[PDB]
Coordinates of C-alpha atoms and ligand atoms in Angstrom, one line a residue:
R10 CA 10.6 20.3 15.1
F11 CA 12.7 17.2 16.6
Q12 CA 11.2 16.7 19.8
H13 CA 9.8 13.9 19.7
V14 CA 12.9 12.0 18.6
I15 CA 14.7 9.8 21.0
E16 CA 18.3 10.4 21.0
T17 CA 20.3 7.4 20.0
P18 CA 20.9 4.3 22.4
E19 CA 24.6 4.6 23.0
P20 CA 26.9 1.7 22.3
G21 CA 25.7 -1.7 23.6
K22 CA 22.3 -0.2 25.1
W23 CA 20.4 -0.3 22.6
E24 CA 18.9 -3.7 24.7
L25 CA 15.5 -2.9 26.3
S26 CA 16.5 1.2 25.2
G27 CA 13.5 4.0 25.2
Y28 CA 14.1 4.4 21.9
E29 CA 13.2 0.5 21.1
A30 CA 10.3 0.6 23.3
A31 CA 9.2 3.6 20.8
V32 CA 9.4 2.4 17.6
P33 CA 5.8 2.1 16.0
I34 CA 5.0 -2.4 14.8
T35 CA 4.3 -0.8 11.7
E36 CA 7.8 0.2 12.1
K37 CA 9.3 -1.9 13.4
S38 CA 12.4 -5.0 11.4
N39 CA 10.6 -8.2 11.1
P40 CA 12.4 -10.1 13.2
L41 CA 12.2 -13.6 10.0
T42 CA 13.8 -11.1 7.6
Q43 CA 16.3 -9.4 8.6
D44 CA 18.6 -11.2 6.0
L45 CA 16.2 -10.4 3.5
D46 CA 18.8 -8.3 1.3
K47 CA 21.0 -10.9 0.6
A48 CA 18.6 -13.9 0.0
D49 CA 17.9 -15.3 -3.1
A50 CA 14.9 -15.0 -5.6
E51 CA 13.8 -18.7 -3.6
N52 CA 13.9 -17.5 -0.2
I53 CA 12.9 -14.2 -1.0
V54 CA 9.6 -15.8 -1.6
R55 CA 9.4 -17.6 1.3
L56 CA 10.5 -14.4 3.7
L57 CA 7.3 -12.4 1.9
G58 CA 5.1 -15.6 1.9
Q59 CA 5.6 -15.8 5.4
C60 CA 5.3 -12.8 6.0
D61 CA 2.4 -11.9 4.4
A62 CA 0.3 -15.0 6.6
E63 CA 0.8 -14.0 9.3
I64 CA -2.2 -11.1 9.2
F65 CA -4.2 -14.7 9.4
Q66 CA -2.6 -15.3 12.5
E67 CA -4.2 -15.7 15.6
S68 CA -0.5 -14.7 22.5
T69 CA -4.6 -14.2 20.7
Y70 CA -4.4 -10.6 21.7
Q71 CA -6.0 -8.0 19.6
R72 CA -5.5 -10.1 16.6
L73 CA -7.9 -9.9 12.9
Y74 CA -9.8 -13.4 14.3
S75 CA -9.7 -11.8 17.7
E76 CA -13.6 -11.4 19.5
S77 CA -12.7 -7.8 20.5
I78 CA -11.7 -7.3 16.3
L79 CA -14.5 -9.3 15.1
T80 CA -17.1 -7.5 17.4
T81 CA -15.5 -4.0 16.2
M82 CA -16.4 -5.4 12.6
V83 CA -20.0 -6.2 13.7
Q84 CA -20.7 -2.9 15.1
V85 CA -19.1 -0.9 12.1
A86 CA -21.3 -3.0 10.0
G87 CA -24.3 -2.0 12.0
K88 CA -23.7 1.5 11.9
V89 CA -22.6 1.2 7.6
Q90 CA -26.6 -1.0 7.4
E91 CA -28.4 1.8 8.4
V92 CA -27.0 4.2 5.8
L93 CA -27.5 0.9 3.0
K94 CA -31.7 1.1 4.7
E95 CA -31.4 5.1 3.9
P96 CA -29.4 5.5 0.9
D97 CA -31.2 9.7 0.7
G98 CA -28.7 11.4 1.9
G99 CA -26.6 8.8 2.8
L100 CA -23.2 7.9 1.9
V101 CA -20.1 5.7 2.6
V102 CA -16.8 8.1 2.7
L103 CA -13.1 5.7 2.7
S104 CA -10.1 7.9 2.8
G105 CA -6.1 7.8 2.5
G106 CA -2.9 7.9 1.5
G107 CA -1.1 6.1 -0.8
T108 CA -1.5 2.8 -0.8
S109 CA -4.8 3.6 2.1
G110 CA -6.4 5.8 0.0
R111 CA -5.4 3.3 -3.7
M112 CA -7.8 1.2 -1.3
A113 CA -10.6 3.4 -0.5
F114 CA -10.7 3.9 -3.8
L115 CA -11.0 0.1 -4.5
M116 CA -13.6 -0.4 -2.0
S117 CA -15.7 2.2 -3.5
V118 CA -15.4 0.5 -7.2
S119 CA -15.9 -2.4 -5.7
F120 CA -19.0 -2.3 -3.6
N121 CA -20.7 0.7 -5.9
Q122 CA -20.5 -2.2 -8.7
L123 CA -22.1 -4.8 -6.1
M124 CA -25.0 -2.3 -5.3
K125 CA -25.8 -1.3 -9.5
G126 CA -26.0 -4.9 -10.2
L127 CA -28.6 -5.3 -7.7
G128 CA -29.7 -2.1 -9.1
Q129 CA -28.6 0.3 -6.2
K130 CA -28.0 3.3 -6.1
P131 CA -24.5 3.6 -5.3
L132 CA -23.5 4.9 -2.1
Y133 CA -19.7 5.1 -2.0
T134 CA -17.3 7.4 -2.8
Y135 CA -12.9 7.7 -2.0
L136 CA -11.3 10.6 -1.1
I137 CA -7.6 10.4 -1.5
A138 CA -4.6 12.0 -0.5
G139 CA -3.6 14.2 -3.7
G140 CA -6.9 13.9 -5.7
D141 CA -6.9 11.4 -8.6
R142 CA -3.8 12.1 -10.0
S143 CA -2.9 9.7 -6.6
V144 CA -4.3 7.0 -7.8
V145 CA -1.8 6.1 -10.5
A146 CA 1.6 8.3 -9.1
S147 CA 3.1 8.8 -6.3
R148 CA 1.8 12.1 -4.5
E149 CA 2.6 11.2 -0.9
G150 CA 3.1 14.5 0.2
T151 CA -0.8 15.6 -0.4
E152 CA -1.3 13.8 3.0
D153 CA 0.6 15.7 4.5
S154 CA -1.9 18.3 5.3
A155 CA -5.1 18.0 7.6
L156 CA -7.3 20.7 6.3
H157 CA -6.7 19.3 2.8
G158 CA -8.7 16.0 4.3
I159 CA -11.2 17.8 5.7
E160 CA -11.7 20.0 3.0
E161 CA -12.3 17.2 0.9
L162 CA -14.7 16.0 3.0
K163 CA -16.8 18.7 3.5
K164 CA -17.2 18.5 -0.2
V165 CA -18.0 15.4 -1.1
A166 CA -20.6 15.2 2.7
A167 CA -22.6 18.4 1.3
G168 CA -25.9 18.3 1.6
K169 CA -26.1 14.7 3.4
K170 CA -27.9 13.4 6.4
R171 CA -25.9 11.0 7.8
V172 CA -21.6 9.8 6.1
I173 CA -19.8 7.0 7.7
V174 CA -16.0 8.2 7.3
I175 CA -13.6 5.3 7.0
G176 CA -10.6 6.9 7.7
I177 CA -7.2 4.3 6.9
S178 CA -3.3 5.3 7.6
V179 CA -2.1 1.7 8.9
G180 CA 0.8 3.9 10.8
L181 CA -1.9 5.9 12.2
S182 CA -0.2 8.6 10.2
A183 CA -1.0 10.0 8.0
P184 CA -2.6 13.5 9.4
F185 CA -5.3 13.5 5.8
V186 CA -7.1 11.2 8.1
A187 CA -6.8 12.5 11.6
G188 CA -7.8 15.8 10.0
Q189 CA -11.2 14.2 8.1
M190 CA -12.3 11.6 12.4
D191 CA -11.4 15.0 14.1
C192 CA -13.8 17.1 12.1
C193 CA -16.0 13.9 11.9
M194 CA -16.1 13.7 15.9
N195 CA -16.8 17.5 15.9
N196 CA -20.7 16.7 13.9
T197 CA -22.0 13.2 15.0
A198 CA -25.4 13.9 14.3
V199 CA -24.1 13.6 10.7
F200 CA -21.2 12.1 10.7
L201 CA -19.6 8.2 12.5
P202 CA -16.1 7.7 11.4
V203 CA -13.7 4.8 12.1
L204 CA -9.8 4.8 12.0
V205 CA -9.0 1.6 10.6
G206 CA -5.1 0.9 11.4
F207 CA -2.5 -1.4 12.7
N208 CA -0.8 0.4 15.6
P209 CA -1.7 0.1 19.1
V210 CA -3.5 4.0 19.5
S211 CA -0.1 4.8 21.9
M212 CA 2.1 4.0 19.1
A213 CA -0.4 6.0 16.5
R214 CA 2.3 9.6 15.5
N215 CA 2.3 12.3 18.1
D216 CA 4.5 15.2 16.0
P217 CA 2.9 18.1 15.3
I218 CA 0.9 18.6 12.1
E219 CA 2.1 21.2 10.6
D220 CA -2.1 22.8 9.7
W221 CA -4.2 21.1 12.9
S222 CA -3.7 21.6 16.4
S223 CA -3.8 17.7 17.5
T224 CA -1.6 15.3 17.0
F225 CA -3.3 11.7 14.8
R226 CA -2.4 10.3 18.9
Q227 CA -4.7 12.5 19.9
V228 CA -7.0 11.9 17.7
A229 CA -7.1 8.7 17.7
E230 CA -7.5 8.8 21.6
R231 CA -10.4 10.6 21.1
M232 CA -11.5 8.2 19.0
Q233 CA -11.5 6.1 22.4
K234 CA -13.4 8.3 24.7
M235 CA -16.1 8.5 21.5
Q236 CA -16.3 4.6 20.6
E237 CA -17.8 4.1 24.5
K238 CA -21.0 6.0 23.3
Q239 CA -21.0 4.0 20.2
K240 CA -19.8 7.7 17.8
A241 CA -16.4 6.8 16.5
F242 CA -14.4 3.6 16.4
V243 CA -11.2 2.2 16.1
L244 CA -10.3 -1.0 14.4
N245 CA -6.9 -1.8 14.8
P246 CA -5.9 -5.7 14.6
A247 CA -2.6 -6.0 15.3
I248 CA -1.0 -7.8 12.1
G249 CA 2.8 -7.7 13.2
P250 CA 5.6 -6.2 11.3
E251 CA 5.8 -5.9 7.3
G252 CA 8.7 -7.9 5.9
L253 CA 10.5 -4.8 4.6
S254 CA 10.5 -2.2 7.5
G255 CA 7.7 -0.2 6.9
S256 CA 6.6 -1.4 3.3
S257 CA 2.8 -1.1 4.7
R258 CA 1.8 -1.5 1.1
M259 CA 2.0 -5.0 1.7
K260 CA 0.5 -6.8 5.0
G261 CA -1.2 -3.5 5.9
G262 CA -2.8 -3.1 2.6
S263 CA -3.8 -6.6 2.7
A264 CA -5.3 -6.8 6.0
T265 CA -7.1 -3.3 5.2
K266 CA -8.3 -5.3 2.0
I267 CA -9.5 -8.1 4.0
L268 CA -10.7 -6.3 6.7
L269 CA -13.3 -3.9 4.7
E270 CA -14.5 -6.4 2.3
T271 CA -16.3 -8.6 5.2
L272 CA -17.4 -6.2 7.1
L273 CA -19.0 -4.4 4.7
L274 CA -20.2 -7.0 2.4
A275 CA -21.9 -8.2 5.9
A276 CA -23.3 -4.8 6.2
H277 CA -24.8 -5.6 2.3
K278 CA -26.1 -9.2 3.6
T279 CA -27.7 -7.9 6.4
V280 CA -29.9 -4.8 4.4
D281 CA -30.5 -7.4 0.3
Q282 CA -30.6 -10.7 2.6
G283 CA -31.8 -10.1 6.0
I284 CA -28.9 -11.8 8.3
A285 CA -27.5 -9.2 10.8
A286 CA -23.5 -9.6 10.8
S287 CA -21.8 -12.1 13.4
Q288 CA -18.3 -12.8 14.7
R289 CA -19.2 -16.4 12.8
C290 CA -19.5 -15.2 9.6
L291 CA -16.9 -12.7 9.8
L292 CA -14.7 -15.7 10.0
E293 CA -15.6 -17.8 7.8
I294 CA -14.8 -15.4 5.3
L295 CA -11.5 -13.9 6.5
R296 CA -10.8 -18.3 6.0
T297 CA -11.7 -18.1 2.9
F298 CA -8.8 -15.2 2.5
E299 CA -6.8 -16.8 4.6
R300 CA -7.1 -20.3 2.2
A301 CA -6.1 -18.2 -0.5
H302 CA -2.6 -17.5 0.8
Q303 CA -2.1 -21.4 0.8
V304 CA -3.9 -21.5 -3.0
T305 CA -1.5 -18.5 -3.8
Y306 CA 1.6 -19.7 -2.3
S307 CA 1.7 -23.0 -3.3
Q308 CA 3.4 -21.4 -7.2
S309 CA 6.1 -19.9 -5.3
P310 CA 8.8 -21.6 -7.6
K311 CA 7.1 -19.9 -10.4
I312 CA 7.0 -16.2 -8.4
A313 CA 10.5 -16.8 -8.0
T314 CA 11.1 -17.3 -11.4
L315 CA 9.0 -14.3 -12.8
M316 CA 11.5 -12.0 -9.3
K317 CA 14.1 -13.3 -11.6
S318 CA 12.9 -11.7 -15.0
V319 CA 11.5 -8.3 -13.4
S320 CA 14.9 -8.0 -12.1
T321 CA 16.8 -8.9 -15.4
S322 CA 14.8 -5.9 -16.6
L323 CA 15.9 -3.8 -14.4
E324 CA 19.0 -4.6 -14.1
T325 CA 19.6 -3.9 -18.0
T326 CA 17.5 -0.4 -18.0
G327 CA 14.2 -1.9 -19.2
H328 CA 10.7 -1.3 -18.3
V329 CA 8.2 -4.0 -16.9
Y330 CA 4.4 -3.4 -16.6
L331 CA 1.8 -4.7 -15.0
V332 CA -1.1 -5.3 -17.4
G333 CA -4.3 -6.3 -15.4
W334 CA -8.1 -7.0 -17.1
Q335 CA -10.9 -5.6 -14.9
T336 CA -10.3 -4.4 -11.5
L337 CA -6.8 -7.2 -11.6
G338 CA -5.4 -3.8 -13.8
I339 CA -6.1 -1.7 -9.8
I340 CA -4.1 -3.9 -8.5
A341 CA -1.2 -3.7 -11.5
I342 CA -1.5 -0.3 -10.9
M343 CA -1.5 -0.1 -6.9
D344 CA 2.4 -2.0 -7.6
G345 CA 3.8 -0.2 -9.5
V346 CA 3.1 3.0 -8.4
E347 CA 5.1 2.2 -4.9
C348 CA 8.1 1.1 -6.5
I349 CA 8.9 5.3 -7.0
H350 CA 9.0 5.9 -3.1
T351 CA 9.9 1.8 -2.0
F352 CA 13.0 1.3 -3.7
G353 CA 13.9 4.6 -5.3
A354 CA 12.1 3.6 -8.8
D355 CA 11.7 5.8 -11.5
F356 CA 8.4 6.2 -12.6
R357 CA 9.0 4.7 -16.1
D358 CA 10.4 1.4 -14.2
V359 CA 7.1 -0.7 -13.3
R360 CA 4.0 0.8 -14.5
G361 CA 0.2 -1.1 -13.7
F362 CA -2.2 -1.1 -16.7
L363 CA -5.9 -2.1 -16.3
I364 CA -8.2 -3.5 -19.4
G365 CA -11.5 -3.0 -19.9
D366 CA -14.1 -0.3 -18.6
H367 CA -12.8 2.2 -16.9
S368 CA -15.5 4.8 -16.7
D369 CA -17.7 4.6 -13.0
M370 CA -13.9 3.6 -11.1
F371 CA -12.9 8.0 -11.1
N372 CA -14.8 11.1 -9.9
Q373 CA -12.3 13.3 -11.5
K374 CA -10.9 11.5 -14.8
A375 CA -9.8 15.4 -15.6
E376 CA -7.4 15.7 -13.6
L377 CA -6.2 12.5 -15.7
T378 CA -6.1 12.9 -19.5
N379 CA -3.5 13.8 -21.0
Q380 CA -1.6 14.8 -17.7
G381 CA 1.6 13.1 -18.7
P382 CA 3.7 10.0 -18.7
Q383 CA 3.6 9.8 -14.8
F384 CA 0.2 9.3 -15.2
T385 CA -1.1 6.6 -17.9
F386 CA -2.8 3.7 -17.2
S387 CA -5.4 3.0 -19.1
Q388 CA -6.7 0.8 -22.2
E389 CA -5.6 4.0 -24.6
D390 CA -3.0 4.5 -22.4
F391 CA -1.2 1.6 -23.0
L392 CA -2.0 0.7 -26.7
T393 CA -1.3 4.3 -27.7
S394 CA 1.7 5.7 -25.8
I395 CA 3.9 2.2 -24.4
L396 CA 3.2 -0.5 -26.1
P397 CA 4.6 0.9 -29.9
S398 CA 8.0 1.8 -27.6
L399 CA 8.6 -1.5 -26.2
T400 CA 11.6 -3.3 -26.9
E401 CA 13.4 -6.0 -26.5
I402 CA 15.0 -5.6 -22.8
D403 CA 11.2 -5.0 -21.3
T404 CA 9.0 -7.2 -19.2
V405 CA 5.3 -7.3 -19.7
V406 CA 3.4 -9.3 -17.4
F407 CA -0.6 -10.0 -18.3
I408 CA -3.0 -11.0 -15.2
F409 CA -6.7 -12.0 -16.1
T410 CA -9.5 -14.3 -14.9
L411 CA -10.6 -17.4 -17.5
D412 CA -14.4 -14.9 -17.3
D413 CA -12.2 -12.1 -19.4
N414 CA -12.0 -11.7 -23.1
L415 CA -9.5 -14.0 -24.0
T416 CA -9.7 -13.2 -27.4
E417 CA -8.6 -9.6 -26.3
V418 CA -6.1 -11.2 -24.2
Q419 CA -4.4 -13.0 -27.1
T420 CA -4.7 -9.7 -29.1
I421 CA -2.8 -8.1 -26.6
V422 CA -0.4 -10.5 -26.3
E423 CA 0.4 -11.2 -29.4
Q424 CA 1.5 -6.9 -29.7
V425 CA 3.9 -7.1 -27.5
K426 CA 5.3 -11.1 -28.3
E427 CA 6.4 -8.8 -31.3
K428 CA 8.2 -6.5 -29.4
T429 CA 9.8 -8.1 -26.5
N430 CA 10.4 -12.3 -25.3
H431 CA 9.6 -11.0 -21.6
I432 CA 6.2 -11.9 -21.1
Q433 CA 4.3 -14.0 -18.5
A434 CA 0.6 -14.5 -17.3
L435 CA -0.9 -14.6 -13.7
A436 CA -4.0 -16.7 -14.9
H437 CA -6.7 -17.2 -12.2
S438 CA -9.6 -19.2 -13.3
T439 CA -12.7 -21.4 -11.4
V440 CA -12.4 -25.1 -11.3
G441 CA -13.6 -27.1 -14.3
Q442 CA -12.2 -24.3 -16.9
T443 CA -8.8 -24.9 -19.3
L444 CA -6.9 -22.3 -20.6
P445 CA -7.7 -21.7 -24.5
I446 CA -5.3 -23.6 -26.5
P447 CA -3.4 -20.4 -28.5
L448 CA -2.9 -19.3 -24.5
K449 CA -1.3 -22.3 -23.5
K450 CA 1.4 -21.6 -26.7
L451 CA 1.4 -18.5 -25.9
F452 CA 2.6 -19.2 -22.2
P453 CA 3.9 -22.6 -21.7
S454 CA 4.9 -21.8 -18.4
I455 CA 2.0 -19.5 -17.0
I456 CA 1.5 -18.7 -13.7
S457 CA -2.2 -20.6 -13.4
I458 CA -4.1 -20.2 -10.3
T459 CA -7.1 -22.1 -9.6
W460 CA -9.9 -21.9 -7.4
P461 CA -12.9 -23.8 -6.0
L462 CA -16.3 -22.5 -6.4
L463 CA -17.5 -20.9 -3.7
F464 CA -21.4 -21.7 -2.7
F465 CA -21.7 -18.3 -0.1
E466 CA -25.3 -17.7 -1.6
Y467 CA -25.1 -14.0 -1.1
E468 CA -21.1 -13.3 -0.8
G469 CA -19.7 -15.8 -3.1
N470 CA -18.9 -14.0 -6.2
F471 CA -17.5 -10.8 -4.5
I472 CA -15.6 -13.4 -3.0
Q473 CA -14.1 -15.2 -5.3
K474 CA -12.9 -12.0 -7.3
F475 CA -12.2 -10.2 -4.5
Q476 CA -9.9 -13.7 -3.3
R477 CA -8.1 -12.9 -7.1
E478 CA -7.5 -9.3 -6.6
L479 CA -5.7 -10.7 -3.1
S480 CA -3.9 -13.2 -5.0
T481 CA -2.6 -10.9 -7.7
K482 CA -1.8 -8.3 -4.6
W483 CA 0.7 -11.1 -2.9
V484 CA 1.8 -12.2 -6.2
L485 CA 3.4 -8.7 -7.7
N486 CA 4.4 -7.0 -4.4
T487 CA 6.7 -10.2 -3.9
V488 CA 8.1 -10.2 -7.7
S489 CA 8.2 -6.5 -7.5
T490 CA 9.9 -6.3 -3.2
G491 CA 11.6 -9.3 -4.5
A492 CA 12.6 -7.7 -7.9
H493 CA 14.6 -4.5 -6.4
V494 CA 15.9 -6.5 -3.6
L495 CA 17.5 -9.0 -6.1
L496 CA 19.6 -5.1 -7.0
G497 CA 20.9 -4.3 -4.0
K498 CA 18.4 -1.7 -3.0
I499 CA 17.5 -2.8 0.1
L500 CA 19.9 -2.9 3.6
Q501 CA 19.2 -6.4 6.5
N502 CA 15.0 -4.8 5.9
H503 CA 15.3 -1.3 5.7
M504 CA 14.1 0.4 3.7
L505 CA 18.1 1.9 2.3
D506 CA 17.3 3.4 -1.0
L507 CA 13.9 5.1 -0.4
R508 CA 12.7 8.8 -1.8
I509 CA 11.8 11.3 1.3
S510 CA 7.9 12.0 0.3
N511 CA 6.4 12.6 3.4
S512 CA 6.3 13.8 7.2
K513 CA 6.4 9.8 7.8
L514 CA 9.1 8.4 5.5
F515 CA 11.0 12.1 6.6
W516 CA 10.9 10.1 10.3
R517 CA 11.4 6.8 9.0
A518 CA 15.0 8.3 6.8
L519 CA 16.0 9.9 10.8
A520 CA 15.4 7.0 12.7
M521 CA 17.2 4.5 10.2
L522 CA 20.5 7.1 10.5
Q523 CA 20.5 7.0 14.2
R524 CA 20.1 3.0 13.4
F525 CA 23.3 2.9 11.1
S526 CA 25.5 4.9 12.3
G527 CA 25.2 4.8 16.4
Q528 CA 25.6 8.3 16.2
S529 CA 23.9 11.6 17.8
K530 CA 20.1 12.6 16.8
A531 CA 22.2 15.4 16.7
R532 CA 24.5 14.7 13.8
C533 CA 21.7 12.3 12.3
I534 CA 19.6 15.3 12.1
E535 CA 22.2 17.5 10.5
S536 CA 24.0 14.6 7.7
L537 CA 20.1 14.0 6.8
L538 CA 19.3 17.8 6.1
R539 CA 22.7 18.6 4.5
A540 CA 22.0 15.5 2.4
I541 CA 18.2 16.8 1.6
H542 CA 19.4 20.0 0.5
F543 CA 22.8 19.8 -1.1
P544 CA 24.8 21.7 -2.6
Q545 CA 23.1 24.5 -0.9
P546 CA 24.5 24.2 2.7
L547 CA 22.3 24.6 5.9
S548 CA 21.7 27.1 7.5
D549 CA 19.5 28.0 11.1
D550 CA 17.0 28.6 8.7
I551 CA 17.1 25.0 6.8
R552 CA 17.5 23.8 10.3
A553 CA 14.7 25.6 11.6
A554 CA 12.7 24.9 8.4
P555 CA 9.1 22.6 8.5
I556 CA 9.1 18.9 7.6
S557 CA 7.2 20.0 4.9
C558 CA 10.1 22.1 3.0
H559 CA 12.6 18.8 3.2
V560 CA 10.2 16.9 2.1
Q561 CA 9.2 19.1 -0.7
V562 CA 13.2 19.2 -1.7
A563 CA 14.3 15.2 -0.8
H564 CA 11.2 13.9 -2.7
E565 CA 12.8 13.9 -6.7
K566 CA 16.4 12.8 -4.6
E567 CA 17.5 8.9 -5.3
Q568 CA 19.9 7.8 -2.2
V569 CA 19.4 10.1 0.3
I570 CA 19.6 8.1 3.1
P571 CA 23.2 6.0 1.7
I572 CA 24.5 9.6 1.3
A573 CA 23.8 11.1 4.3
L574 CA 25.1 7.7 6.3
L575 CA 28.4 7.5 4.7
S576 CA 28.8 11.4 5.7
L577 CA 28.5 9.8 9.3
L578 CA 30.4 6.5 8.8
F579 CA 33.1 8.0 7.1
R580 CA 32.8 11.5 9.0
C581 CA 32.9 13.4 4.9
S582 CA 31.8 15.4 2.5
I583 CA 28.4 15.2 0.2
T584 CA 30.6 14.8 -2.4
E585 CA 33.1 12.0 -0.7
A586 CA 29.9 10.6 0.3
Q587 CA 28.3 10.1 -3.4
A588 CA 32.1 9.0 -4.8
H589 CA 32.2 5.9 -2.5
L590 CA 28.2 5.7 -3.8
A591 CA 29.2 5.9 -7.5
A592 CA 32.3 2.5 -6.9
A593 CA 29.8 0.7 -5.3
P594 CA 27.5 -2.2 -7.4
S595 CA 24.6 -0.8 -4.8
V596 CA 23.9 1.1 -2.5
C597 CA 23.6 -2.3 0.0
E598 CA 27.1 -2.7 -0.9
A599 CA 28.6 0.8 0.0
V600 CA 26.6 0.9 3.0
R601 CA 27.8 -2.7 4.2
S602 CA 31.2 -2.5 2.9
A603 CA 30.9 1.0 5.1
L604 CA 30.2 -0.9 8.2
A605 CA 32.5 -3.3 8.1
Ligands
F1P8 O1 -1.1 6.4 6.5 P1 -0.5 4.7 6.1 O2 -1.1 3.9 5.3 O3 0.4 4.6 7.4 O4 0.5 4.8 4.4 C1 0.1 6.0 3.8 C2 1.2 6.3 2.8 O5 1.0 6.9 1.5 O6 2.9 7.0 3.5 C3 4.1 6.7 2.6 C4 4.5 5.4 1.9 O7 4.8 4.6 3.3 C5 2.6 4.7 1.4 O8 3.7 3.5 1.0 C6 1.9 4.3 2.2 O9 0.9 4.6 1.7
CA9 CA1 15.5 12.1 -9.7

C-alpha cells in the first residue's frame, strides 16, 4: 500500500533529496509564504494576493501565456466548436472532484446560460464526484473511485455521437477523472478527452487506484501519446505552488476557471461570429482577467478588515454566511465548503448561499431537497432555516452587483441586521453606477469594486460576469483562508488541521508527518494509522487495509495530523498527545512548542 512513499531524508540531507525532487508542484511549499502561519491579516492578504497573481506570470516554459499552452487551447476550442455546430448527438461534459467538480458545475451553468441567451439548445453537463450533494457538502472521498467516474460518464453520454470530456484535476490526481480519460481513449470515434491540471505529467499520481489497473500518471502518459494524433489533449499550464500548500481551490481553481472560460468563449465565438480561436485573442481575454487581479487587490485594506471580522465570529463560536446573488452565490457556496477539510471546520462554520434562480443548474436536485443541514444553499434555505436562528455573534457577507434586484438585497440585509451588526458587502458595479442611498447607509464601509465597460463585441458581457465571479472568488478565498490562519489552524504554510477526506489528503498527511518529525516512513505511517483508528489499536489487518478504509475512519475526525505528530515528537501515546494539544491555545502553538 505504501511502496510509492519515499523514505524520509536523514537530518541535514533534505537538500537535493530524491524525496524533495518527487514532491508535485501542486503539493510544494511556496517559497514566499513560509511564514503565513504567523502573518497578521494585512500580511496574509499581501501573501495570498501575490500567490493569486502568479497564475498570470509569464523562465516562460509551459506557463498559461506560453505559445505551447495557447496552441493547445486553440486546438481544444477547435474540437469543442465541432460539437457546438452539431447539437444533434453532441455533448460537452466537464468533470472533477471537490472544487474541480464545482468548477465543472459552474462552467456548465455559465455556458448553458450563454447558449440559452442565444436561443440555442444547451449542450453542457457536469459530473461531480458524489453527485449534487458534493456541490454543497464535503464529500471528497467519492472521487477515489475510477469506476464511479466511468459509470457517471456512460450515463450522460448514452445515445450521443460526439462527446467532449473535460476532466479537471489540479493535482493530476483524482481517480474519478483518470477512469473517465482512460475510457474516453477506448472510443475516440465518440469521445474527445481533455485533461486539465497544474502539474507536469511526470508528477501525476502514480500510486495505485483501488478499482483501476492504470494509475493517473499512466492514463496521462496514454493521453500524451494520443495528443500526437489530436485524439486527446493534456492542458497542464505551470502556475507554481499554492500559498497554503496543496490548497488547489486557490490558484488551481482560479487557473481552471480562466483557462476554461477563455477557451470555451473562443469556441462559441467561432460558431456564432465565425472568428476562429487564436493565441492573440485568447491572450486579450486572459489579460482582462489579469487586470481583474489589480482591481480586486486594490481593496486589500478592506479585505483584511473583513478577514478579521470573520475570524472574530469563528473564534467566538459564531457562524459565517456568504450570501451571493445569482452566480456569485455559486462562488460563495464553493468557498465555505472547502473550509471543512482544509482547516477542520464544522459544516456549520462557513456556508455559502445563492439568492435568485437556480432552476436550470442542477441535474439531480432531488439529491438535495430536504436532505439535512449539511445540504442547505438556496434562497429558501437561507430565509427559512438560517435567518430565524442568526445570533449577534454571526457574520453575514452579502455579495451582489448593481444589476441585481437591490430592493431584495436591501430587504434581506435589513432582516439580517435585526439579528447581527456583523454585516459587510462586496458590491460589483460598472463605472457610472452608484449604490442606492439606503445600501450606502447599511454598508458605510462597503467593499465597492468598480469595473470599466468592456467592448469585446461577442464576449464583453460574459467576461464582465466572469471577472466579477473571479474577483469574488479571490476575496472570499483570501478571507476564509486568512480567518482560519489567524486562529492557529496551519503550520508554516501547511494544512496542520487537515481532515483526511480522500486519498490525496491521506498522502499529504503522511508527507506532513515526515517533513515535520524527520522520522522514518515506517514510524510516520504507524503514527498516522494509530491516530486515525484510535481508540482501535493497530493490527496487521489495519496496516494492510486499503487507503479508502483509513479515509472512511479519518474523514470526520479533527486534529489527526497534530495528534500523530505530537505522538512522534514526544514518543508518547495518543491520550498523552491529546492532553498536550488540549493544554495549548491552538494546534499551531502546540506543534511549534513541541518543535522548539
Ligand atoms: O483533483 P484535484 O483538483 O487536485 O483535487 C480534488 C479535491 O477534491 O481533492 C481534495 C481537496 O484538495 C479538494 O479541495 C480538491 O478539490
Ligand atoms: Ca467530528
